[PDB]
């Protein structure tokens, strides 16, 4: 199983569901994969306290997450009505397990 990192996909901007009627393509980058490092004592503690119903019944993440640490600045394209658009932070640029 591939570990947490950057993945790439060529997409048509109109496939993204963001309201842009354009046949342009963008290189969409994202973060995916497994966080494989040894479990933290923090998380092992937290898992036990959660099982024991000690955490005030709230949303708690007791596992690392593969998420972007930085995003693409901008990407632009022209739509079918001859209008230009620029989207900021559409793609991930770097990934980490946190």
């Amino acid at each position: 199983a591939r570990p947490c990192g950057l993945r790439e996909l060529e997409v048509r901007v109109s496939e993204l569901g963001l309201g842009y009627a354009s046949d342009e393509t963008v290189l969409f980058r994202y973060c995916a994969g497994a966080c494989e490092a040894a479990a933290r004592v923090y998380d092992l503690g937290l898992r036990r306290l959660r099982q024991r119903r000690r955490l005030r019944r709230e949303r708690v993440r007791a596992q690392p997450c593969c998420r972007p640490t930085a995003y693409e600045d901008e990407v632009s394209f022209l739509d079918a009505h001859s209008r230009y658009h620029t989207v900021h932070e559409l793609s991930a640029r770097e990934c980490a397990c946190v």
Partner: protein
């Protein structure tokens, strides 16, 4: 050979030259001046030339034009050293290349940003970003966007939009072409880019392509090198094949220059060299 920035360093170090050049600089603008000009026009400074995308290009050109002063030629010598649809395809290649994508988006976002209801964009900033695109992205990307061939209006409209003309090309007033030339020639860069276009794209009756030395690449580079200045040229409309490019100007209000103005404009609008070069690029052979 030695460029003008280096030629000026060698002059600034030597006793007689630096003295003559300080004299000329104070004269401009600004007998003792005529003597300073003559010495410098007989020094190797007079043979110095510049290069596109060089470091300190503007300084180089300021030096060149300070000694290359009989006056007001129709064609000035170039200071530069000699050397589904296809438009959608070109945009894809550019968006899949990190450097092209960045520099493309950068001009689009600057050129598309309204300042106020009376200011469509920051034209100065837009132009600057357009130059960065044409100077720092390889021609394999940029020319394929600018000179792509089209069979329908959607393709031609996309091609027309490459430079975001609403900001970079169009204006409330359409000046007379000679007035626009006048303004262009007061700027060191524009003046030089226009002279470079004249040297490489001026039609010849002697060659199979009608281009000088049958050199399509040199003409295309010089054409694209005028984008981002006062004389920025573009496709005048979205006709697929009937390609016509021009700066933003007309020959109305010429008076006794109607002959000269029209001749100037025909180097863009009715030039078999430029026509053939743009068409040969799009054909891929």
């Amino acid at each position: 050979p030695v460029d003008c920035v280096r030629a000026n360093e060698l002059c600034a170090a030597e006793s007689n030259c630096s003295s003559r050049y300080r004299t000329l600089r104070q004269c401009l603008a600004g007998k003792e001046c005529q003597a300073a000009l003559e010495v410098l026009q007989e020094s190797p400074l007079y043979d110095c030339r510049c290069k596109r995308g060089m470091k300190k290009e503007l300084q180089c050109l300021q030096i060149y034009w300070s000694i290359h002063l009989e006056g007001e030629e129709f064609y000035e010598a170039s200071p530069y050293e000699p050397v589904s649809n296809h438009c959608l395809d070109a945009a894809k290649a550019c968006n899949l290349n990190d450097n092209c994508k960045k520099l493309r988006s950068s001009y689009i976002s600057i050129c598309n940003r309204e300042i106020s209801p009376t200011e469509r964009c920051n034209r100065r900033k837009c132009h600057k970003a357009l130059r960065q695109f044409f100077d720092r992205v390889p021609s394999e990307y940029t020319y394929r966007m600018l000179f792509c061939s089209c069979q329908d209006q959607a393709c031609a409209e996309r091609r027309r939009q490459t430079i975001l003309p609403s900001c970079s090309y169009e204006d409330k007033e359409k000046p007379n072409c000679l007035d626009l030339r006048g303004v262009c020639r007061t700027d060191h860069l524009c003046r030089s880019r226009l002279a470079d276009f004249h040297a490489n794209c001026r039609a010849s009756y002697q060659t199979v392509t009608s281009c000088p030395a049958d050199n399509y690449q040199a003409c295309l580079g010089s054409y694209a090198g005028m984008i981002g200045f006062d004389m920025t040229p573009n496709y005048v409309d979205s006709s697929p094949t009937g390609i016509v490019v021009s700066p933003w100007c007309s020959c109305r209000g010429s008076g006794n220059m109607e002959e000269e103005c029209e001749k100037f404009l025909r180097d863009f609008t009715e030039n078999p060299c430029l026509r053939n070069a743009i068409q040969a690029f799009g054909n891929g052979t």
